[PDB]
Structure 1
């Protein structure tokens, strides 16, 4: 029986805009339906600002022993330790998220799948690819959206559909559902090849190695977040920046608008009221 009590409702987590815990709480109730599909079955990494975006935050992955018993969870082994993650898959789970002041929710591109037998959750294959397009110092949007279309076209050549999401920060994330789910290892190799093929077509506009030295006036097409041990901001997640911006799904037509900007939480709310989930095809097989 899922219950969550909001405390400090009027406490401001975004000093610049007066955005409160209750605002955040309402936002996540507002997006639950369209957001859940994309984080369902996935280990939820939280980044938390209990005292607002002008105060120290922390990453949290392990689930606290005192977190509500009804939260679904699963365990991931990694290079030097085990970790039990929460899995958010209900509106109440996003209520907890908001009460926790977990402004940001991050997930990998794979989901847990049950063991043949009786339900032990283990990491499954990548169900989608993500690309992170990071604009170097002084990089035009004409450069950013041109690169995003180029990635789209490459992926289309191999039968894949691509959905753009402004990261709410500086980035631009592109997601592709896989009709043939593959290992995170394979997905990474595939993504790397795409990033690299693109680099070769427009070396002055695109780079595929992260090294900050080759990162000025160029778009860095980051392919590495398809690694199974990496994580990416969830679609619809708030960002812990001075403004309550969101990893907002966009249309390709919107990318054609030179007046493309990062959206705030409330703009996202009305867009949903207008168009529902642009990312509806992304996780059509979600739990």
Structure 2
């Protein structure tokens, strides 16, 4: 289990001078809190080899050159088969940094080992996710109000919801599923939540993607519960002008109208103070 960090001094975020080495330091720093929420999941790497002012790609297939110690599993998609890495150790996060994989994206299900053969196949959804996107003119205050409304509807079912500022423009919400549920079943439940909210507050919420009608509304994207979709991992850096993070928040923080995205240094400071706000999500 060995990684050599090359171009450690290469700036990946020109705006802030943040380097590959800084990204390595960050991922080392968040390893203990981040690994639980990506354990057992295929990791998709969004890479910016020349930094955030240069092109990115969304890399799913594991390269032939990938180190032999990386855990991996295969997924049959509608075209064929893809081998993914599974990130489950500090060394794995060191590899992520070396790859300039600023963002780590995962589905809401984990691999499960076969009864007799120990072969890894996709298992049930372990959590629901909601991806909340602000339409034009929509401020953080409205995103937070809609997030509370999602939380309340799920609370009517005895489900708990954890808020995450995405690091980009919106909010992500996670709710742990106590009993096993298929990704199909998860997508149905999430869609019904979204639709219920849109019916209750059609001027403030939409459950459909079409952008012509998104202005003034929060689009509550329920579709990333699909087995074939991903959502950025909690604690992931973002490939944006600033090295912001998909940062777990408290509901009390969401009562602040000045609510904003957090930078990676802030997230480290918060972990030092409070540990993992998502500790109960994948326990």
Same structural fold, with TM-score higher than 0.5 when normalized by the shorter chain? yes
Q: Deviations over 1:3-57 (max 9, x none)?
A: 1111111110000100001000000000000000000000000010110000111
Counterparts of 1:9 and 1:233, CA distance in 2 = 24
* Kept after mapping to 1: 8 A contact 2:140/2:260: no
The CA deviation at 1:59 is 1.1
The answer to whether 1:232 aligns with 2:231 is yes
Contact 1:128 1:181 in 2 (8 A): no
Deviations 1:162-188 (A, max 9, x none): 000011011200000001120000100
Partners of 1:181 and 1:195 in 2: CA distance: 21
CA deviation string 1:44-94 (max 9, x = no partner): 000101100001111111111111101000000001010000000001100
Distance in 2 separating the partners of 1:180 and 1:229: 21
Contact 2:141 2:259 in 1 (8 A): no
Deviation readout 1:79-131 (Å, 9 max, x if unpaired) = 10100000000011000000000000000000000000131000000000000
Unaligned 5+ segments in structure 1 are 283-287
Q: CA deviation at 1:140?
A: 2.4
> Do the aligned residues in 2 keep the contact of 1:188 with 1:227 (CA within 8 Å)?
yes
- Is this contact kept in 2: 1:73–1:84, CA < 8 A? yes
* Regions of 4+ moved over 3 Å: none
Partners of 1:139 and 1:13 in 2: how far apart? 30
Question: Equivalent residue of 2:45, what SS?
Answer: strand
Q: Is the 8 A contact 1:198 1:206 kept in 2?
A: yes
Q: Secondary structure at the match of 2:252?
A: helix
The answer (yes or no) to whether the contact 2:45–2:59 under 8 Å persists in 1 is: yes
Shift of 1:142: 2.3
CA distance in 1, matches of 2:139, 2:233: 25
How much is the aligned-residue C-alpha RMSD, in angstroms?
0.6
Q: What is the alpha-carbon distance in structure 2 between the residues aligned to residue 171 and residue 137 of structure 1?
A: 12
Contact 1:251 1:278 (8 Å CA) reproduced? yes
- How many Å apart are 1:270 and its aligned residue? 0.4
Tell me how many residue pairs correspond in the alignment.
281
Deviation, 1:257, is 1.1
Shift of 1:214: 1.1
Alignment partners' CA distance in 2, 1:140 and 1:248: 18
- The 1-side partners of 2:141 and 2:268 are apart by 27
